[PDB]
Nucleic acid binder design. Structure first.
Ligand SMILES: [Mg+2]
Ligand SMILES: [Mg+2]
Ligand SMILES: [Mg+2]
Ligand SMILES: [Mg+2]
Ligand SMILES: [Mg+2]
Ligand SMILES: [Mg+2]
Ligand SMILES: [Mg+2]
Ligand SMILES: [Mg+2]
Ligand SMILES: [Mg+2]
Ligand SMILES: [Mg+2]
Ligand SMILES: [Mg+2]
Ligand SMILES: [Mg+2]
Ligand SMILES: [Mg+2]
Ligand SMILES: [Mg+2]
Ligand SMILES: [Mg+2]
Ligand SMILES: [Mg+2]
Ligand SMILES: [Mg+2]
Ligand SMILES: [Mg+2]
Ligand SMILES: [Mg+2]
Ligand SMILES: [Mg+2]
Ligand SMILES: [Mg+2]
Ligand SMILES: [Mg+2]
Lengths: 185, 134, 167, 260
RNA sequence: UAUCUGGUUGAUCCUGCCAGUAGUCAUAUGCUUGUCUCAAAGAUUAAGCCAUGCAUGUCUAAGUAUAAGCAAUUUAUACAGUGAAACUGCGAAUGGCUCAUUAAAUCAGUUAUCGUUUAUUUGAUAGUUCCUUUACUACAUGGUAUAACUGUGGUAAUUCUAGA
RNA sequence: AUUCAUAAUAACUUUUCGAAUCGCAUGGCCUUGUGCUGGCGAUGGUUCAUUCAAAUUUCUGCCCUAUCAACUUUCGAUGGUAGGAUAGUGGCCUACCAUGGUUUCAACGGGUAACGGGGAAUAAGGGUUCGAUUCCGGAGAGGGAGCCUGAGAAACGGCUACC
C-alpha cells in the first residue's frame, strides 16, 4: 500500500523489422550523429509521434478555441525554446512538419561538436560521458541533453575538467611522475 | 581560503519551536562535502548564538561537485535545542547518548514472556522452587 | 489438579462454561467465557488435598496452626474505616490514628503510611461549593436570557401588530 | 466494517490538502469535530504543509502541546483537529491570526487577519428549531448551537459569532444581490452576488451568482455561503477575491509580473 | 500508429484460410549480463497444510500506591518524588491479508431516512431529588467486598488455579 | 409534505439522569471561626444538535448459455389487517384473509479457468481483450452454525459446539 510510481516507455519500435530504406536511413542518422543504438532514433521518432498527435487534434479544433490557443502556444513555445522549431514559422502547421534531424541537431553531443570544442561527434560524446562539458556551471554527462537555445552560449569545458583546469589529468600525472622518476628532482 | 561561502536561504523564524530554520547552500569548489561540524560552527558565528544550538541536516551535494544543499536549524538557546531536536540528531552532535536498549526482537520476546505471568510472579517462583525441592 | 467447585453436587469432574465472578476461572477478555473441567463438591477418594477451616478450637494447642498469629498486612485506608477500626466516633481526627510502618535501609528508618480516602478537606468543600454555585448561576443566567428574549418577542409583536393593523 | 475507520490512506485524502503522492502511505485522518472530514483542514496539515512551521508530525505535536495554536479561541492540542471554513487560527507566538478561507482554486489559503477580525467568525445557519422548554436555537455550519436566536433568522442566513461568548452579533439574510462565497462543488472559492434563487421544491434549490466581471454560474444552495452585502464583506477576503481567471489570462499575468 | 508479405496453378484472377509481421504495467522459460535511477514480486495450481519467532496494547499536574520497590520528602506523622504489580478506564470492530463464495447479488453513479442506531469530537443543556409532608434519613461527605499483596497448596503439563 | 419541532393535561415506571470524583493556585471578606466566598483546568453525566459513521433504501447499468420455456406458491410465493420481533421500515416472523408475483423486452435454470468499480493492453475511427493485485466498496479467516462483551463484531492473533 502506497501510491504507485508512474513510468512510461520512451520509444516504439518500427512496424516492419527489415526495410532496407529505413535501415539505411537509420544508419545514416546514427553515423552522422554518432548514436549508439537504433533506439536513439526510435526515441526521437516516438517524441515526434506524441508532438504530432497533440498538434494534430489541436488543428482539428477550430481557431480561437481556448484549448487550441492555450496548448498550441505552449507546444510552440517549448519547441522554439529548445530550438527544434525555428523562431519564425511559429505555428501548429509548422510543428507538424518537424523531422528527426531537427531534434538530433539539438543534442548536447551535436552542439558540443558544432561549437568547436570536440572536432567530432564521437569525440563529443566521449568528452560528454567523461564529464568534460558543463552546460552552464553544471557538468552534464548525458549526450541527449536537449540544449534549450539559452544554454548554447554557456556550453564550455567543465571547471573541474583537465580541459577546464585545476588538474592535469590522471594519466598525464602518472606519466609526468615517471619522467620525474627517470630524470631526478 | 577556498571560498566555502556558506549562505542560508528561505530563512523563517519559528517562535513556535523557538528557533530559526533555513536552507543551507554551500559552495565548496575544489572540495567535497565540507562537513556537518564546520557548517555548524560557521553557522554558530553567523547567527551568533552557539555551536550547540545549531542543527544541520540534509546536504545532498550537486551532481558534478562543488556545491551542497541542506537544511539548518538555529535555536534561541541550547536548552530549547535539547527540548525540540530529535534524539538521533543530539546523539549526532554529542549532546545526548545513544540509550542502551535491547534488540527489537528481544524486547518483544521479553514482553510476550511476561504476558504469561499474572501478578509479580514471585509467588509463582516460590511455588516452583518448593515443588521442585520437595 | 482440578479444583472442587461449590454447588456441583457430584463426586466427579464435569466441564462447565465459566463466566465472570465464578471460581476456577480468571477471564482474560471482556465478557469472555471458557469451558473448563471442575471437580465436584462431593469429597471422595478421587481428591488429593482438602482445604479445611477450623471453626471451633480443641483442647490442645496445635504446633503451627493456632499457636501462631499472622500480622495483618494492611491497616484501614478509608476514613470511617479507621474510625470503626479504632472505635473513635462519627466525628474525630483520624490522621492521628493512621498506622505508620517503619522501613530501614541500613541507616535511614523512614515511615510510610496510607493516603486516607474520603477524607474531609477544604479542597473537597471548595469543589462542593463551586458545583453548587455553578448550578445556581447557570440557572440565573438561563432565566435572564429567557427574560431578554421575552421582551424582544414582545417588542417584535408590538411592531408587527401595529404595522399590520394600521397598514 | 464492524465499526468506524481510523485510517486515511494517502490518495484517499481530500485533494485540496495538496499532499504529495509519495513520502507516505497515509494522510492525517481528521478527528471528529466541527467540520466534515472532506471539508476540513487538520491542524497538522495547516502547521506543517501550509505554514512550514513544522517539519514533521512530531514537531506539529510539539507545537500543539505547548498550547500555542488555538481554533476559534480554544487551544486544541489535537493534531488532527478538523478546522474548516471560516475557522480562526491564532498563534500567540508570532502574534499571527488566520481565517480559513478557500482561494479561488478550491483550496484553503494562508490568509492573515488582524486581531479585530480574529475576534469573530461567521456561521451559516444550518437549522432553526425549538429545543426543550420551547427554547429556540440555531445551528451553524461549524456545529455551534446558539440559543435564543433572533426570530428573523432563517436557514441559509449568516450570523456573526462573538467567538469569545458564543453569541450572535448580527446577521445577513439570503436574498438576491447579497455577496456570497462558494463553499463546495467545482466553483469552490468563487465570490459573487446572488442574482436569484430557484426553488425546486422537493430537492436541490439552486443559486445564480455573478462575480465582479459579470461571470455567472449556477451552484446548489448547499454550497452557497452569504458573506456580506453588495461589496463590503464582513470578512477580509483573500487575494483574488474569487474572480476565477481563465488559464490564458492566468498565464498572461504570470508572464507579466514574472518579467517585472 | 488509416501499410501488409509467403503458400493451392503449367501460368491467371478470385474466394479462403494457414504462415509470417508489430505490441502486451503478460506470464513462464533459455542464453547473456558492466553502470545509475525506478521497484513488481506464492494471484493463477492448493480460501491446501503449517514448525518457529514476532504482528495490541496503553498513565498524564489531573481515577486507585503502605511494593515489606528505588530515590528517601519540601509542615509534609494521612498522602505528596519516581513508580513494578493489580483494580479502574480506554483500545483491541482500525490496520494488514486474500478473492473462496457472490450474476440485479456485490458494485458504479444517483436518491431516501417525514423509516432508524450512533462511543468519540465539537456546541448547547440540569435551583425542582419532600414514602400519601401535617413518619425527611451523615452532606465538614454512605456502606461492604475484592484485586494486586501475605501465606498454605494441587496438577506431567496451560496466559490452570484453590483454600485462608 | 406530517400525528414535525415544541408545549399542555391525567396518570404510569422492578424510576433514568439531575457531580459522595481529581490536579494546580490557594485570592477576597468579616461575628478570626483553622468561619463565609473564590479561580484556572481534569474527568464524569442527561438530552438535543454536530462530527465520524452504520443499517436499510430509489432509479439505470453485468459475461456465456434455449441441447434451460416456463418459474414462485407444501415449510411466504404476491398483497391486506392485526400482532410480535427489530434500532427502526418491510412476510422479517406469526395468526387470519385474498390469489397473487415474474417471464420470448429471455423469467426460472445451468456455466464462469466471475469479487465489482476506479482502471489496463492494443487501437485511424468504431471496437477487442483484460482488471486476483498500490485507491474505493464487498466478502472471509479450515468448513458450518451459535453467542458474550461492547457505541460498534454474528469478531475469529474472542468464546461455544459440531465436522
Ligand atoms: Mg478491515
Ligand atoms: Mg486467416
Ligand atoms: Mg559510480
Ligand atoms: Mg494461493
Ligand atoms: Mg500476494
Ligand atoms: Mg501484523
Ligand atoms: Mg473497545
Ligand atoms: Mg506489509
Ligand atoms: Mg501478502
Ligand atoms: Mg468509545
Ligand atoms: Mg484521568
Ligand atoms: Mg402485512
Ligand atoms: Mg407491521
Ligand atoms: Mg472465484
Ligand atoms: Mg475488477
Ligand atoms: Mg478486482
Ligand atoms: Mg482466484
Ligand atoms: Mg468478518
Ligand atoms: Mg489455509
Ligand atoms: Mg467468528
Ligand atoms: Mg491468525
Ligand atoms: Mg483480526
Amino acid at each position: 500500500p502506497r501510491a504507485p510510481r508512474t513510468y512510461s516507455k520512451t520509444y516504439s519500435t518500427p512496424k516492419r523489422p527489415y526495410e532496407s530504406s529505413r535501415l539505411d536511413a537509420e544508419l545514416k542518422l546514427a553515423g552522422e550523429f554518432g548514436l549508439k543504438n537504433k533506439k536513439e532514433i526510435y526515441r526521437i521518432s516516438f517524441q515526434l509521434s506524441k508532438i504530432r498527435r497533440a498538434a494534430r487534434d489541436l488543428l482539428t479544433r477550430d481557431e480561437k478555441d481556448p484549448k487550441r490557443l492555450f496548448e498550441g502556444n505552449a507546444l510552440i513555445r517549448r519547441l522554439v525554446r529548445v530550438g527544434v522549431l525555428s523562431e519564425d514559422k511559429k505555428k501548429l502547421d509548422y510543428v507538424l512538419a518537424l523531422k528527426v534531424e531537427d531534434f538530433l541537431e539539438r543534442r548536447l553531443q551535436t552542439q558540443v561538436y558544432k561549437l568547436g570544442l570536440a572536432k567530432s561527434v564521437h569525440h563529443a560524446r566521449v568528452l560528454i560521458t567523461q564529464r568534460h562539458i558543463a552546460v552552464g556551471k553544471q557538468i552534464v554527462n548525458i549526450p541527449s541533453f536537449m540544449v534549450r537555445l539559452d544554454s548554447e552560449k554557456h556550453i564550455d569545458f567543465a571547471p573541474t575538467s583537465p580541459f577546464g583546469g585545476a588538474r592535469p589529468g590522471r594519466v598525464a600525472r602518472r606519466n609526468a611522475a615517471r619522467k620525474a622518476e627517470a630524470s631526478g628532482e | 581560503s577556498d571560498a566555502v561561502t556558506i549562505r542560508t536561504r528561505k530563512v523563517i523564524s519559528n517562535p513556535l519551536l523557538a528557533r530559526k530554520q533555513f536552507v543551507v547552500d554551500v559552495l565548496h569548489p575544489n572540495r567535497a562535502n565540507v562537513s556537518k561540524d564546520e557548517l555548524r560552527e560557521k553557522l554558530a558565528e553567523v547567527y551568533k548564538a552557539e555551536k550547540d544550538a545549531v542543527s544541520v541536516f540534509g546536504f545532498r551535494t550537486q551532481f558534478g561537485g562543488g556545491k551542497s544543499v541542506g537544511f539548518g536549524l538555529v535555536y534561541n538557546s541550547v536548552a530549547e535545542a535539547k527540548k525540540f531536536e530529535p534524539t538521533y540528531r543530539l546523539v549526532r552532535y554529542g549532546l545526548a547518548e545513544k540509550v542502551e536498549k535491547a534488540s527489537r526482537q528481544q524486547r518483544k520476546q521479553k514482553k510476550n514472556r511476561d504476558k504469561k505471568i499474572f501478578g509479580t510472579g514471585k509467588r509463582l517462583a516460590k511455588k516452583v522452587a518448593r515443588r521442585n525441592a520437595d | 489438579g482440578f479444583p472442587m467447585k461449590q454447588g456441583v453436587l457430584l463426586p466427579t469432574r464435569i466441564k462447565l462454561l465459566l463466566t465472570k465472578n465464578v471460581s476456577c476461572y480468571r477471564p482474560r477478555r471482556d465478557g469472555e467465557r471458557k469451558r473448563k473441567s471442575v471437580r465436584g463438591a462431593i469429597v471422595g477418594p478421587d481428591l488429593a488435598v482438602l482445604a479445611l477451616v477450623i471453626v471451633k478450637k480443641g483442647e490442645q494447642e496445635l504446633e503451627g496452626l493456632t499457636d501462631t498469629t499472622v500480622p495483618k498486612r494492611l491497616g484501614p485506608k478509608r476514613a470511617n474505616n479507621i474510625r470503626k477500626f479504632f472505635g473513635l466516633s462519627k466525628e474525630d481526627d483520624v490522621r492521628d490514628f493512621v498506622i505508620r510502618r517503619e522501613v530501614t535501609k541500613g541507616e535511614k528508618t523512614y515511615t510510610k503510611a496510607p493516603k486516607i480516602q474520603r477524607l474531609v478537606t477544604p479542597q473537597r468543600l471548595q469543589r462542593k461549593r463551586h458545583q453548587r454555585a455553578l448550578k445556581v448561576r447557570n440557572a440565573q443566567a438561563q432565566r435572564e436570557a429567557a427574560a431578554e428574549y421575552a421582551q424582544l418577542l414582545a417588542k417584535r409583536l408590538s411592531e408587527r401588530k401595529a404595522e399590520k393593523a394600521e397598514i | 466494517a464492524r465499526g468506524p475507520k481510523k485510517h486515511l490512506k494517502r490518495l484517499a485524502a481530500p485533494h485540496h490538502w495538496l499532499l504529495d503522492k509519495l513520502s507516505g502511505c497515509y494522510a492525517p485522518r481528521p478527528s471528529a469535530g466541527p467540520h466534515k472530514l472532506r471539508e476540513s483542514l487538520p491542524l497538522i496539515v495547516f502547521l506543517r504543509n501550509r505554514l512550514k512551521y513544522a517539519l514533521n508530525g512530531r514537531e506539529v505535536k510539539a507545537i500543539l502541546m505547548q498550547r500555542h495554536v488555538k481554533v476559534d479561541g480554544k487551544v486544541r492540542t489535537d493534531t488532527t483537529y478538523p478546522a474548516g471554513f471560516m475557522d480562526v487560527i491564532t498563534l500567540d507566538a508570532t502574534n499571527e491570526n488566520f481565517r480559513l478561507v478557500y482561494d479561488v482554486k478550491g483550496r484553503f489559503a494562508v490568509h492573515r487577519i488582524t486581531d479585530e477580525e480574529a475576534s469573530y467568525k461567521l456561521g451559516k445557519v444550518k437549522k432553526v428549531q425549538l429545543g426543550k422548554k420551547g427554547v429556540p436555537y440555531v445551528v451553524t455550519h461549524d456545529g455551534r448551537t446558539i440559543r435564543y436566536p433572533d426570530p428573523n433568522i432563517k436557514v441559509n442566513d449568516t450570523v456573526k459569532i462573538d467567538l469569545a461568548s458564543g453569541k450572535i452579533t448580527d446577521f445577513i439574510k439570503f436574498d438576491a444581490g447579497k455577496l456570497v462565497y462558494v463553499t463546495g462543488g467545482r466553483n469552490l472559492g468563487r465570490i459573487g452576488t446572488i442574482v436569484h434563487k430557484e426553488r425546486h421544491d422537493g430537492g436541490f434549490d439552486l443559486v445564480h451568482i455573478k462575480d465582479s466581471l459579470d461571470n455567472t454560474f449556477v451552484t446548489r444552495l448547499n454550497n452557497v455561503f452569504v458573506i456580506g452585502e453588495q461589496g463590503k464583506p464582513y470578512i477580509s477576503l483573500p487575494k483574488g477575491k474569487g474572480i476565477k481567471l481563465s488559464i490564458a489570462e492566468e498565464r498572461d499575468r504570470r508572464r507579466a509580473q514574472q518579467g517585472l
